[PDB]
Amino acid sequence: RESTMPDRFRYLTKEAPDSPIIWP
Amino acid sequence: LSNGFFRSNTRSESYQYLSNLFISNGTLLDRMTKTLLKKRWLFSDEMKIGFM
């Protein structure tokens, strides 16, 4: 897919997972 | 309009100085054009990195 988006910012469009809570 | 032959020669000397400055540092713009053809997008940090 052709896009007008730079290669450096490609990791910033994905939602990183978060560690679930553990103290309960 | 006796003030049309003055701006032209001033721009001529500006172009001559720009040519003389660009000719010596032609490798900078040559590698930089190669970089721009290589990677589509380009910033000023890459300017300052590629000034070498």
Angle at B12 between CA B47 and CA B16, to 5 degrees: 50
Please give the structure tokens belonging to residue A9.
């910012």
CB environment B8-33: b (16+ within 10 A), e (fewer)? eeeeeeeeeeeeeeeeeeeeeeeeee
C-alpha distances (whole Å) from B8 to each of B17, B28, B48, B50 are 14, 29, 33, 34
The DSSP letter of residue B25 is T
3-state secondary structure of B30: helix
Q: How far is A11 from chain B (nearest CA, A)?
A: 15
Residues of A in contact with B41 (CB under 8 A): 5-8
Instruction: Reduce the secondary structure of A1-24 to three states and give it as a string.
Output: CCCCCCCHHHHHHCCCCCCCCCCC
**Nominal resolution in Å?**
3.3
**What experiment produced this structure?**
cryo-EM
Residues of A in contact with B40 (CB under 8 A): 6-7
